[PDB]
Design a protein around this ligand. Structure first.
Ligand SMILES: C[C@H]1C[C@H](N)c2cc(S(N)(=O)=O)sc2S1(=O)=O
Ligand code: MMC
Ligand SMILES: [Zn+2]
Length: 256
């Protein structure tokens, strides 16, 4: 099955998921001098004060923090979105070295990691139906660069010994996502897809201009996780990111 190594990595995914060669694949490089300022784009509205985190889980390719999405508790609206998108989970993509890790790049510059806050369009009723639609999901992408510690990330960093290998989980309640937002909600946005299998082209990408910073020792702990399940050859979970894909006639709009 798919992974990120030499034999099962991004360049092989097309054989099992033929849409990997499609029209609106993600990530992409954001060329800032060709992104079009669009004055009709509304400001983002992130209402995350009611968020209920439930679990953190290592799934073999990253770790997800899962949220209760049975009611409009943490939602995203505004920006390029029509209607309410509900937060279901967030995960990161990171590298083995600080100058790689992000999926989206900005003028070909790579960051140390990228956070994806995954939301689904409530008019389709459940997540399963939303991935059958072109505007079914919105992922909010935030870049991470190494510098000062981000206080709000430390509770996640501390539970990671508890989920070191594939399949493990831990209860992870009362985590507030607002502690991972940068100061500015300025964004670029373009129509894309999931960046891991099944690579469904259902996503409205909203990538924030401003990186949050995290310390070197906060990023180092991400690299101690394992792709492998318990009691197998140790395989450090580093470099779980997809290279930039062709823009193919999409336009990236900027809110600034
Ligand atoms: C069911 C999951 C299937 C994939 N593992 C996936 C990848 C996501 S990304 N890297 O594009 O933000 S969101 C997501 S999901 O649809 O939640
Ligand atoms: C069509 Hg998703
Ligand atoms: Zn992701």
């Amino acid at each position: 099955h798919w992974g990120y190594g030499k034999h099962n990595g991004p360049e092989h995914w097309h054989k099992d998921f033929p849409i990997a060669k499609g029209e609106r694949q993600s990530p992409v490089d954001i060329d800032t001098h060709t992104a079009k300022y669009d004055p009709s784009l509304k400001p983002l509205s992130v209402s995350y004060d009611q968020a209920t985190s439930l679990r953190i889980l290592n799934n073999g390719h990253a770790f997800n923090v899962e949220f209760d999405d049975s009611q409009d508790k943490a939602v995203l609206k505004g920006g390029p979105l029509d209607g309410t998108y509900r937060l279901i989970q967030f995960h990161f993509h990171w590298g083995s070295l600080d100058g790689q890790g992000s999926e989206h790049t900005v003028d070909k510059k790579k960051y140390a990691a990228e956070l994806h806050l995954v939301h689904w369009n409530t008019k389709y009723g459940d997540f399963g139906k939303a991935v059958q639609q072109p505007d079914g999901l919105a992922v909010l992408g935030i870049f991470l660069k190494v510098g000062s510690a981000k206080p709000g990330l430390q509770k996640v960093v501390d539970v990671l010994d508890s989920i070191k290998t594939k399949g493990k989980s831990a209860d992870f309640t009362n985590f507030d996502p607002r502690g991972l937002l940068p100061e500015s909600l300025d964004y670029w946005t373009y129509p894309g897809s999931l960046t891991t299998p099944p690579l469904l082209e259902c996503v409205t990408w909203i990538v924030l201009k401003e990186p949050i910073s995290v310390s070197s020792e906060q990023v180092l702990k991400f690299r101690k996780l394992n792709f492998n399940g318990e009691g197998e050859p140790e395989e450090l979970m580093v470099d779980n990111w997809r290279p930039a894909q062709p823009l193919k006639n999409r336009q990236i709009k900027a809110s600034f």
